[PDB]
Amino acid sequence: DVKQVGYVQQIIGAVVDVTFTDSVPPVLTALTVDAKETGTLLTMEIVQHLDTKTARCICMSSTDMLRLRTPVVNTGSQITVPVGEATLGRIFNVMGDAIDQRGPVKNKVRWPIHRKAPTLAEQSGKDEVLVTGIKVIDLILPYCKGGKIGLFGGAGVGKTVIIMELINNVAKGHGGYSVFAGVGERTREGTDLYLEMMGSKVIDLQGDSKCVLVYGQMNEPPGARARVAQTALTMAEYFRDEAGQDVLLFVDNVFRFTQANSEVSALLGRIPAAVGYQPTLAEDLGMLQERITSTVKGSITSVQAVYVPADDITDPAPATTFSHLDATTVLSRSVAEAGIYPAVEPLECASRIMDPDAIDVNHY
Amino acid sequence: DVKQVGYVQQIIGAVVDVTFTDSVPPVLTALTVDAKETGTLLTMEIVQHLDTKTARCICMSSTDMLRLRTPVVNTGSQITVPVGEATLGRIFNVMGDAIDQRGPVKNKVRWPIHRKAPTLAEQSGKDEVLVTGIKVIDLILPYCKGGKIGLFGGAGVGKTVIIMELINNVAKGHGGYSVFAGVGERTREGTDLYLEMMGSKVIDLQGDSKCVLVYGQMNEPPGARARVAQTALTMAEYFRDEAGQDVLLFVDNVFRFTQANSEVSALLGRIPAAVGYQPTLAEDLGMLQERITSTVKGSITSVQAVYVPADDITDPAPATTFSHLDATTVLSRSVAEAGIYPAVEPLECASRIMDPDAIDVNHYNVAMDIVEMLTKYKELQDIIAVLGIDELSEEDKLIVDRARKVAKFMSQPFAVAEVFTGMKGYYVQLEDCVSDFGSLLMGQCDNIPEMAFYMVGGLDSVKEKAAKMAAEAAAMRERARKAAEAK
Amino acid sequence: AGGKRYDLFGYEVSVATGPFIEEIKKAQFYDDAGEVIVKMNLANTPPDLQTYNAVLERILNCKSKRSQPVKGENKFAAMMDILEEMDARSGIKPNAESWGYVLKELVQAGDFRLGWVCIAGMKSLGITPDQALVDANEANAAKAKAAGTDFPAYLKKAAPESFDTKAWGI
Amino acid sequence: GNITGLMQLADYTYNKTRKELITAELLEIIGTMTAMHAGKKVGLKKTEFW
Amino acid sequence: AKQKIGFVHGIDGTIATIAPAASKVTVPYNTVLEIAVSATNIANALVFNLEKDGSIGVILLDNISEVRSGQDVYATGSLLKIPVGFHMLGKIINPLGKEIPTGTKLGLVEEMAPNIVSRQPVNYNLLTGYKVIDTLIPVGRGQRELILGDRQTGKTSIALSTILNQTKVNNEILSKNNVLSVYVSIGQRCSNVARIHRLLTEYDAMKYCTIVAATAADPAGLQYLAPYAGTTLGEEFRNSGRHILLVYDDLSKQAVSYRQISLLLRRPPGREAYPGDVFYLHSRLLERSAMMSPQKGSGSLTSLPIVETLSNDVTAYIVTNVISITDGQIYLDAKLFTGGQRPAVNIGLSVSRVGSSAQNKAMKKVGGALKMLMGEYRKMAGEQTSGSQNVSPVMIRGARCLQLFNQKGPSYFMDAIVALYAVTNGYMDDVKLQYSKFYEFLLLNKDLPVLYGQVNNKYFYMYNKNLNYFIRYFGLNHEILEPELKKYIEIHTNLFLDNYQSRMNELKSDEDLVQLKNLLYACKRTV
Amino acid sequence: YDDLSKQAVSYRQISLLLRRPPGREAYPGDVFYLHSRLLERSAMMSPQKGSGSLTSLPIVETLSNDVTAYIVTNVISITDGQIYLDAKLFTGGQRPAVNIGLSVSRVGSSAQNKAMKKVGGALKMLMGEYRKMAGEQTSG
Ligand SMILES: Nc1ncnc2c1ncn2[C@@H]1O[C@H](COP(=O)(O)OP(=O)(O)OP(=O)(O)O)[C@@H](O)[C@H]1O
Ligand SMILES: Nc1ncnc2c1ncn2[C@@H]1O[C@H](COP(=O)(O)OP(=O)(O)OP(=O)(O)O)[C@@H](O)[C@H]1O
Ligand SMILES: Nc1ncnc2c1ncn2[C@@H]1O[C@H](COP(=O)(O)OP(=O)(O)O)[C@@H](O)[C@H]1O
Ligand SMILES: [Mg+2]
Ligand SMILES: [Mg+2]
């Protein structure tokens, strides 16, 4: 059928307004502009309506050389990204496009990045300790298979190293498809991880890969970093539900997802709440967190990192992230300055499986 | 003759805008909306104007099921409130409507709610002490008749219990009248006070009452919670000026009267202050506080309370309430956690009538000497925490023990605190309240132990408690002797 | 035809209580009597001693709390809780009839130890029990004594000589 | 010497908290004021002048 | 016929703006609207702002993803309502009344509170099951006592243990004096609600309990109206003369939702970004707690709101706003939770503004002793015990009482008064501190005199569980229970000190010592 | 002046209600200039101007002995000296409860008379040593 068309109205950073003569599409709908005008393909998801015949939408790529009357095309659907075994051993972008220069991903179906969370009937909390091999993590704050994990720590404390040690320990001997979502972290770390895995035959391209990589890093604009974690969840939920298989989900880190949404909210005109954060921060973070749950079909043993600016736990982003987790791990700077590593402060840490009913009585 | 009608423009929370074709009424005017549409008579009060034909007004009742462009009647007068003897022994709302199910209110007259403050010529400063029965207050903060009192303190310090005890001790013997004004108060406290005043026969319905009670509680909207104190003042100033009687004016509490207007400040368009309070806070509090004062006609012996949030005295609301008072009683968490009640800090609180000419010289001297002792007591907890008691002179240990006895002695059990203490209250007279503290000030009672002073009244009760404790101690000693004899 | 009653707020109060007592006496499960007390209170008719005694009667004579069975039912606990609601909450005090119903239940249940507490509480308050029920209580006590059911069996067995979290049953 | 060091840390933290609280109150006030300014319409609101 | 009022002008996440139709039709305030997202489905809403140009700022509550711009808007002219009745017990429910699966009457959501004449003072108790909350922080019915504390300190577990405690009594007493319960989970994870439902079903506490869940994935307007819906379910149980208990999980999350709604609707911020009228919110919510007058059925509903705390500060805006509202507070300190003891109540900062009038005759005397003992023990406990044999009785009894305060689950009244009586009267003074709970376990579940044959008491034994209703009426300080209580506890202490204490101290092996250690911790947990 | 802190609150109210741009502690920027409009009018005039003089004793209330506040920092920046009273000394019988270390008069001796300069120099050299001695001695 004939495709709907709209025209740009105003531009403020990544944010764009689009007038649609007939009617406005739904929120989260993608809107594409041809590369003939801007120079590259550019998809833009609607986030709110201002009035009828208008829609405010965020760009994924840069808005450079974008003009005030460029035609815009409604794809008629949300940002669809691939899923399946074809996603294994491949790096992807926010849009599901590959950047590993290997070849065309042989996907069969694509799923939207935005999705309703599982119902209360689907959830099934099974308490089982996850042996990381790390000594502090086991005794005080024992992890839980299928649950969530948080490595809350500032700049230079050692949460990325904890993630890497957990990869070398858990992920390789996991027997299940892993995912690694870089959200606003160093591009160097992605190359190091890709080479470490391509050398460990976890991303054996001539064989079976037990890993997926998604990387929307700090170089990228907020429109990518604010919708990259959802792409990785789209990958993980296919293995969780359809394949019925246990999976991991390493987020490094969620604080840049929050930062990106805050920068976006400023462009959108929403009134900041506290410390220059968006008023919808809790909702925006819960719509992502509650997707990370172990249903009856499978389990997602996430490992999320969190950043604390100025080493402030009272920052709203970690403060809201605390409630959405099963096992916290509050890293410190004074402990690291004392040479101790991991720089855990066990008095601030906590866990949920730390009960005799789950772990043995001596361990408690 | 005919009352003009206005039409609503917008409704944002408790704030509403109204159009008036001919001319807007004055500020603070009452505006009614019939109960036909919203189910209840919805009253409103203009706070400010916007245009020659448009004005905005707060609502003292909740706005639900209210359409736009609804007719709004100009009463031609601000919120009229009943006054007289019939107001006694009756609960009243902001509007003056009796909420108790006792009956209609006989009213030969109905005064307005907002009024100019008394002129300087009308004011009369009479230095006359008020015997509260409380010991700290009798000595360090002699409350002045016809004056203004403030029980500063955070949450859970005892200012409400001090209000209840002061009522029980004063309003009974007060041959005049009394008025209570619950402002942002817990409703449960209203039931407790009403049943106490009924059982105490301060409110004798079949007989003759001498206490008014006005209540706009936490459940009420800000427009009600702000205009309760003015309602109670309309009740009290009648007894002051017309009847010529002496009046008690209890308030709990003024910080809610503040934060209600703060809740509406943003809707009115006024820019907030450093702490988030309204820019007009000081003026808004002064227009109320200056009404609370004695005149040549009568005298309001007002007793107020203020919530000090997070125990932050630097907060502008108490900071502005300091100036509008004569006895700034202060309560602290530290003295309460130490098991002392009332948890008054004698150093942080002061009084105007604490002067040699206004009261007895011996009273002033004993109070100042105790206040001089307690500062050294602070300077010596500074040292004993580090060194120990061994590293101080015997002249220093003497004042340490004396201050340690004074601090425990100025604790007092109240009749209202029977639930918490389990001990009957004591009424300590002012004269005995000086002979006992002076005897302790000059070492006349140093052989007496320390804990004998804890939670008692006068000195006679202290000696009784010391004899008691010595008896039980000898009992434990001889029981240990007999236990060693047995095995 | 009686002294006018009043609430704590000094309001007038109804005394016409017979129509509700009849709703209690017509009941078949002793949870309906509670709802009857509630519907009585909503009409400004607070319960009197006769009403509480009729509720205790309907408790004792009824088979079950509700139409369906319930786990943890105790015919005596509801009675004694009504007594607490009488004395502490409402201010009314019980009489010999009330404690007599309370003792009849302990006689039927065979709980011979609580029966002695009920007996001591009766005469400590001046109430004189019926010797029929005291003799039935002592008879049940003698039966439990001679049959070895003076106490449960799980108390009269040796405790673990070795400390172990599993042995003691925790 | 240790007490001095603790005192300098306490002074740095006190002044840091003081400045941060000042900035926070400022940004609050500017935010409430900015919201009030945002609540102003740009429409002409034309009316007859004859 | 459905009446239309306008069309959806814009939509910003959970909120919306409605533009009026060509007609001049007016809408009321706080009323519910409907948005025809489809020919079949409807998206409920609620009015939050009216404006000079007829536009309507609207909160959305259902099917937000299906909303667009231009959709027609119908008006019901009624406030938000939800189904109410006894048929809702044993259900997890959306605050809109929609049941959440697992694996006629309608009540207004925003009602006025009972007035000053329509509520009796507090007279009855609510046995939370924990000895501290029943002795020194007596919670009552019609009371509104806060639960403070930092993250992961026992805030939710206290309320759950209260609900679990009430069940054993409610299965015994009539259905009028039983206290039901509501657990409102604002902003919480869905897994936590599933685990709570499983716990309540295991202990069978779900017959007398309902849950109102507004998770983080759910709209902010639903998190905003959840506790009002819980109180609305409690309305009927007030007015039907029954009892009911509210457990509002984190109200700070309920305020974040209100902040979101307000600021997105271009309301001005305030202190800590909140609109300013967030105090009136909790005021309207919590002032609905009351102990109703006999004219209104003598009903009641307790409120146990929960508030998170950041670095043990009570200076935040919401915490101060709520402490100003609630009578008492149960302050949970991480320093004590992390310091070993659980529940981590801080008695110096936790209080109750009802006191003896809430708790019972038998508990009044024990609490009057315990308050004095703890006030004396607070002054000495900072001293490292040096006079090990010259220690005072108070230093002993206070430490034993703190040991008894350690729990995991609730405790029966009879299973608590006796244990505290033995402490205040000094019967548990010869045994050491570490064995303070194993003593209690034997005192409540392994009757030693009945085992060792020392049976002289006529009736007083701790196996029946029905003596509670005699202690609850007469009191232990009575002619008939006091001597039997003494002639039970003294033989229990003697048999303990002879057989078990002696065997305990003789242990030197690491294996047997660890076996004993685990036993003592297990007794701390189960008792 | 009793007192200028409340004058500042009044100016803040007038400004904010008239939507003047705000500033630190919700005070406008020129609130300093307000007190400079006032206190600078105080002066010792010249013999060409009648040799008149206007002295000022502006009062400013502190809170918890704060001196880093805005109005206080402004008036201290303006004034030709300052007086600092303390409550710890007001309660200890020292009335007036000055703090000589914080109390300053940049007009040190030119104001004092011929008889007063000698006495004041002696008392300064006495108190400067009394402070050092009492600060280091025990309580005993
Ligand atoms: N176990 C360890 N042993 C030695 N050094 C460690 C250890 N863990 C962390 N470090 C050191 O901490 C520093 C930073 O580690 P990492 O890259 O994990 O930081 P981060 O937590 O990601 O913080 P950021 O991302 O802000 O740099 C490095 O210098 C690293 O060597
Ligand atoms: N009395 C107790 N005994 C033993 N463990 C306890 C006790 N109370 C709480 N806990 C433990 O504390 C942990 C958290 O308790 P809870 O779920 O009540 O915390 P919370 O305050 O709800 O945390 P959050 O604020 O993050 O929701 C759990 O592991 C629980 O088992
Ligand atoms: N005289 C007293 N004796 C014992 N406890 C007291 C006394 N005064 C106050 N309290 C304590 O204060 C509590 C009531 O606090 P309240 O006075 O209502 O606080 P606020 O005055 O801040 O509202 C009591 O429940 C009790 O714990
Ligand atoms: Mg890193
Ligand atoms: Mg919790």
Q: Which helix (H) or strand (E) holds E423?
A: helix E414-424
In this structure, are residues B163 and B151 in contact, taking their beta carbons and an 8 Å threshold? yes
- Bond from prior residue into A104 cis (ω within 30 degrees of 0): no
The amino acid occupying position B234 is T
CA distance B359 to B363: 7
Q: Which of the listed residues A132, A151, A157 should we mutate to test ligand 1's pocket, taking the one with most ligand atoms within 8 A of CB?
A: A157
Query: One of A56, A90, A148, A159 is an active-site residue; which one?
Result: A159
CA distance F121 to F109: 9
The residue written with tokens 């040699």 in the block is B356
- Tell me how close the Cα of B424 comes to any Cα of chain D, in angstroms: 47
Architecture of the domain defined by A79-353: 3-Layer(aba) Sandwich (3.40)
Q: Where in chain B is the domain with CATH 1.10.1140.10?
A: 354-474
Eight-state DSSP code of residue E497: I
CA angle F91, F95, F101 (to 5 degrees): 95
The dihedral sign for the CA sequence F22, F24, F25, F29: negative
Facing B274 at nearest CB: one of D25, D32, D36: D25
Query: One of E353, E397, E503, E525 is an active-site residue; which one?
Result: E353
In this structure, are residues E2 and A38 in contact, taking their beta carbons and an 8 Å threshold? no
CA distance B215 to B211: 13
CA distance B39 to B43: 12
User: Catalytic residue at A159?
Assistant: yes
B157 CB under 6 A from ligand 3? yes
Q: Helix, strand, or coil here: A251?
A: strand
Alpha-carbon separation of residue D22 from B279, D18, F25 (angstroms): 17, 6, 7
CA distance A58 to A53: 17
Alpha-carbon separation of residue A21 from A12, A17, B383, B453, E7 (angstroms): 22, 13, 80, 86, 17
Q: Which helix (H) or strand (E) holds E4?
A: strand E3-12
Full domain range(s) for residue C108: 16-150
Q: Which helix (H) or strand (E) holds A35?
A: helix A35-38
* Class of CATH domain B354-474: mainly alpha
Query: What counts of helices (H) and strands (E) characterise chain F?
Result: 5, 2
**Phi, psi angles (nearest 5°) of residue A261:** -65, -30
Position C48 in a domain: yes
Q: Residues near C19 by Cβ (< 8 Å), separated by ≥ 6?
A: none
Length of chain D: 50
The residue written with tokens 């609580």 in the block is C114
Alpha-carbon separation of residue B8 from B44, B448, E51, E56 (angstroms): 12, 73, 10, 14
Per residue, the 3-state secondary structure of chain B, as one string, reads CCCCEEEEEEEECCEEEEECCCCCCCCCEEEEECHHHHCCCEEEEEEEECCCCEEEEEECCCCCCCCCCCEEEEEEEECCEECCHHHCCCEECCCCCCCCCCCCCCCCCEECCCCCCCCCCCECCCCCEECCCCHHHHHCCCEECCCEEEEEECCCCCHHHHHHHHHHHHHCCCCCEEEEEEECCCHHHHHHHHHHHHHCCCCCCCCCCCEEEEEECCCCCHHHHHCHHHHHHHHHHHHHHCCCCEEEEEEECHHHHHHHHHHHHHHHCCCCCCCCCCCCHHHHHHHHHCCCCCECCCEEEEEEEEECHHHCCCCHHHHHHCCCCCEEEEECHHHHHCCCCCCECCCCCEECCCCCCCCCHHHHHHHHHHHHHHHHHHHHHHHHCCCCHHHCCHHHHHHHHHHHHHHHHCCCCCCCCHHHHCCCCCCCCHHHHHHHHHHHHCCCCCCCCCHHHCCCCCHHHHHHHHHHHHHHHHHHHHHHHHHHHHC
Angle between helices B228-241 and B254-268 (to 10 degrees): 130
Query: Domain E81-353 in CATH: superfamily?
Result: P-loop containing nucleotide triphosphate hydrolases (3.40.50.300)
Determination technique for this PDB entry?
A: cryo-EM
Eight-state DSSP code of residue E434: G
User: Catalytic residue at F106?
Assistant: yes
List b or e across E223-243, with b for residues whose CB sees 16 or more CB atoms inside 10 angstroms: bbbbbbbbbbbbbbbbbbbbb
The amino acid occupying position A160 is T
For every residue of E7-45, DSSP letters joined together read EEEEEETTEEEEEE-SS-----SSEEEEE-SSSS--EEE
Query: Within 10 A of B372 (CB to CB), how many other CB atoms are there?
Result: 17
Q: Residues near A46 by Cβ (< 8 Å), separated by ≥ 6?
A: A18, A24, A25, A26, A27, A28, A29, A31, A55, A56, A57
DSSP H helices in A200-254: 222-225, 228-241
In this structure, are residues B18 and B33 in contact, taking their beta carbons and an 8 Å threshold? no
**Residue C71 burial class via C-beta count within 10 angstroms: exposed 0-12, middle 13-18, buried 19 and up:** exposed
Q: Which of E214, E320, E306, E192 minimizes the C-alpha distance to E260?
A: E214
- Bond from prior residue into B26 cis (ω within 30 degrees of 0): no
CA distance C7 to F14: 54
CA distance B229 to B113: 9
Which chain B residue lies closest to E314 (C-alpha atoms)?
A: B310
For chain A, the chains sharing at least 3 beta-carbon pairs closer than 8 angstroms are D, E
DSSP H helices in A115-158: 135-139
Query: Within 10 A of A37 (CB to CB), how many other CB atoms are there?
Result: 13
CA distance C118 to C104: 10
Distance A331 CA to ligand 4 centre (A): 13
CA distance F82 to F87: 17
CA distance E316 to E310: 9
Report resolution (Å) to 1 decimal: 3.1
In this structure, are residues B6 and B71 in contact, taking their beta carbons and an 8 Å threshold? yes
The amino acid occupying position A347 is L
For every residue of E282-297, DSSP letters joined together read HHHHHTT-EEE-GGGT
CA distance A20 to A22: 6
CA distance A94 to A120: 29
Half-sphere exposure of B367 (CA within 13 A, CB side): 25
A163 CB under 6 A from ligand 1? no
The residue written with tokens 């706080």 in the block is E30
Length of chain E: 527
Residues 4-23 of B with CB under 8 A from E: 9-14, 17
Alpha-carbon separation of residue E303 from B21, B94, E131, E247, E470 (angstroms): 49, 28, 19, 6, 28
In this structure, are residues E424 and E369 in contact, taking their beta carbons and an 8 Å threshold? yes
Q: Which of B328, B321, B334 minimizes the C-alpha distance to B377?
A: B334
- The beta strands (E) that lie in E105-220 are given as 106-108, 119-120, 146-149, 181-186, 209-214
Angle between helices B187-199 and B159-166 (to 10 degrees): 20
Q: Where in chain B is the domain with CATH 3.40.50.300?
A: 79-353
Chain E CB within 8 Å of residue C132 CB? no
Percentages (nearest 5) of helix, strand, coil residues in chain F: 45, 5, 50
Q: Which helix (H) or strand (E) holds A152?
A: strand A149-152
Distance A280 CA to ligand 3 centre (A): 40
CA distance E180 to E168: 12
Q: Helix, strand, or coil here: C40?
A: helix
Query: Within 10 A of A5 (CB to CB), how many other CB atoms are there?
Result: 14
At E475, list the tokens: 């009191």
As beta bridge partners, residue A344 has A331
As beta bridge partners, residue E178 has none
Q: Which of B296, B371, B327 minimizes the C-alpha distance to B129?
A: B327
Eight-state DSSP code of residue A25: P
CA distance A112 to A26: 14
Alpha-carbon separation of residue E154 from E253, E331, E342 (angstroms): 18, 10, 8
Q: Which of E23, E15, E9, E19 minimizes the C-alpha distance to E46?
A: E15
CA distance C99 to A326: 54
**Residue B110 burial class via C-beta count within 10 angstroms: exposed 0-12, middle 13-18, buried 19 and up:** middle
Q: Which residues on chain B place their C-beta less than 8 Å from a C-beta of chain C?
A: 101, 194-195, 198, 205
Distance E103 CA to ligand 1 centre (A): 44
- Bond from prior residue into E121 cis (ω within 30 degrees of 0): no
CA distance A148 to A259: 21
At C95, list the tokens: 């009489």
At E275, list the tokens: 């609109």
**Residue A311 burial class via C-beta count within 10 angstroms: exposed 0-12, middle 13-18, buried 19 and up:** middle
**Phi, psi angles (nearest 5°) of residue B343:** -90, 55
Q: Which fold has domain A4-78?
A: Thrombin, subunit H (2.40.10)
At A140, list the tokens: 């005080």
At E97, list the tokens: 């009344």
Within 8 A of E325 by CB-CB distance, chain B residues are 186, 218
Position C168 in a domain: no
The dihedral sign for the CA sequence B130, B135, B139, B141: negative
Within 8 A of B61 by CB-CB distance, chain E residues are none
Q: Helix, strand, or coil here: E330?
A: strand
Q: Which of E220, E228, E295, E303 minimizes the C-alpha distance to E264?
A: E220
In this structure, are residues E249 and E75 in contact, taking their beta carbons and an 8 Å threshold? no
CA distance E178 to E243: 6
Position C27 in a domain: yes
- Bond from prior residue into B253 cis (ω within 30 degrees of 0): yes
As for how many domains chain C has, the answer is 1
Eight-state DSSP code of residue E179: B
The residue written with tokens 């009038």 in the block is E357
CA distance E160 to E410: 9
